[PDB]
């Protein structure tokens, strides 16, 4: 029931293959739905549910907004190149901003900026102030807080306009967000120097949250467990692996345990 909308902006001074001058991706609960880049110069969908937006002007309006960010971000990169007395070359400007809707119906909002892969400035939307990282960041923090309007305007977007759209996106995408795909699990192993390595692998589970671990006679072997990070598939599903080293003899003793919203009760798997 909690949800998020988040936009990821990336602007570079020197493009490279697969890295346009400016990219914007928007995600509904960590899944892409809208895309804009400086090459195509237009808003395109990344999800099919997007066909029900019914604003009519939506795609053209957001294209003009992206084209604005594209112009402005160029200017920001020049602002900061000169502010930090850097020379012309490869520089990176990134921004992430969006809203969350929590389990209790509460809202959060974010607007954080980075330059060269490091924190630059970020909005604290409840005090209407900014957290600057540098003396360079502070120049902007002063200009933004003296004028006194940018913080107010962003907080209004995150708390109203953003949430208002989130609720609609979540409704238009219910069949995608509310679906469930069970993991395909397989235990595999191989003997090294008298050490059996057990590998448990969950394939194509949706949604993202998952629990995986080894049990030796039903006792959790957490200290000796090597569990990977959740990684994406190309269809919107996820992948995870958990490994354990055992003694070749105590082999029957050991089971993999996968717990996931798609399975009414724990799945148990053995080599």
């Amino acid at each position: 029931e909690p949800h998020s909308v988040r936009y990821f902006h990336t602007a570079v001074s020197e493009p490279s293959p697969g890295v346009p001058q400016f990219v914007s991706v928007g995600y509904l609960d960590g899944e892409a739905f809208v895309y804009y880049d400086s090459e195509t110069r237009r808003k395109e969908p990344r999800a099919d549910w997007t066909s029900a937006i019914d604003d009519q002007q939506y795609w053209e309006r957001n294209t003009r907004i992206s084209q604005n960010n594209e112009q402005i971000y160029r200017v920001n990169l020049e602002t900061l190149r000169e502010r930090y007395n850097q020379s012309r070359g490869s520089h990176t400007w990134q921004r992430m901003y969006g809203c969350d809707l929590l389990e209790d119906g509460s809202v959060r909002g974010f607007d954080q900026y980075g330059y060269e892969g490091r924190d630059f400035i970020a909005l604290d939307k409840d005090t209407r102030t900014f957290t600057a990282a540098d003396a360079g960041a502070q120049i902007t923090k002063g200009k933004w807080e003296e004028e006194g309007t940018f913080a107010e305007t962003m907080k209004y977007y995150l708390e109203n306009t953003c949430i208002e759209w989130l609720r609609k996106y979540v409704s238009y995408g219910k069949d995608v967000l509310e679906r469930r795909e069970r993991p395909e699990v397989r235990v595999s192993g191989m003997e090294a120097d008298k050490t059996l390595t057990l590998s448990c692998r969950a394939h194509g589970f949706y949604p993202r949250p998952i629990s995986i671990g080894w049990l030796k006679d039903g006792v959790v072997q957490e200290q000796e467990t090597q569990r990977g990070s959740t990684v994406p598939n190309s269809d919107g599903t996820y992948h995870i692996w958990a490994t354990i080293d055992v003694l070749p003899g105590d082999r029957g003793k050991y089971q993999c345990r996968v717990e996931h919203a798609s399975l009414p009760q724990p799945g148990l798997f053995s080599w």
């Binding site: 957001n62 907004i65 402005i72 900026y113 400035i121 962003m154 977007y157 306009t161």
Partner: peptide
């Protein structure tokens, strides 16, 4: 929908 106001530093 993205925000209309531009962020200039």
């Amino acid at each position: 929908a993205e925000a209309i106001i531009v962020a200039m530093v």
